Write a protein that binds this ligand. Structure first.
Ligand code: GSH
Ligand code: GSH
Ligand code: ZN
Ligand code: ZN
Lengths: 124, 124
């Protein structure tokens, strides 16, 4: 994999932490680490996804982040949990064959409007 | 790995494409794919890092993206190439032991001010 980690600031840590806690839980993802004023999500102690809430530093415009799912069931569970936590629909779980024949994904906007996806690339 | 891919808009495709072409080349990373109005960087046909240049849609604020290096030599070569292409220094190649004892990295700002890192986590 070419991506090691990413990080960005959001408006409100309480709100964003709650969203990502709920959204990423079905992927077996939790707080891999909390370094200073950042919260790092990851699996098996390896953080890859960092959010911060530095005053005035929040990202503006839409960032797209896609997380990897091992199963289509995980895609669906991410979606349900993210919506329930206040995420806004940006595309229901389903095949996206215009990308490739086995691309199965769902899209939810986070509290700052970022386009958060979970995708499985495998046939089932 | 939990990150599948990311994407965001930048101000000027010619400038950003040139920067990332130069910066990511030492990692064996090139244009894995060009889908519509986006440019996808990746290795072995698998795009992970997408940039676009939609009018008015550019990301504002600082995004941090770190790419994985297999060797410390690669970290250094990324840095030299990124600087030569007009990147701004945000941290020279070297150990960052305050992260962990084998963390070796360099940081360069892209044309839009994003904090681009290449990191090797292995002892050498
Ligand atoms: N509503 C669409 C969302 C598709 C989407 O957001 N795709 C990602 C890339 S995988 C993206 O950033 N698209 C930007 C665009 O399509 O303009 C769906 O349900 O498929
Ligand atoms: N100038 C520093 C840059 C360190 C840096 O940018 N670290 C990343 C995380 S690996 C970051 O986003 N840091 C934000 C901060 O330290 O406030 C260096 O050379 O080490
Ligand atoms: Zn996507
Ligand atoms: Zn970093």
């Amino acid at each position: 994999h070419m991506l090691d980690h990413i990080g960005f600031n959001i408006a409100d840590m309480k709100k964003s932490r709650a969203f990502y806690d709920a959204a990423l839980s079905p992927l077996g993802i939790g707080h891999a680490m909390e370094f200073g004023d950042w919260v790092g999500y990851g699996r098996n102690g390896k953080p890859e996804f960092w959010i911060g809430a530095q005053k005035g530093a929040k990202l503006e415009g839409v960032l797209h982040v896609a997380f990897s799912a091992g199963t289509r069931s995980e895609v669906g569970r991410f979606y349900e949990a993210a919506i329930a936590a206040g995420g806004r629909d940006n595309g229901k779980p389903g095949l996206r064959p215009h990308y490739h024949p086995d691309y199965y994904a769902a899209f939810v906007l986070d509290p700052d409007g970022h386009n958060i996806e979970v995708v499985c690339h495998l046939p089932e």
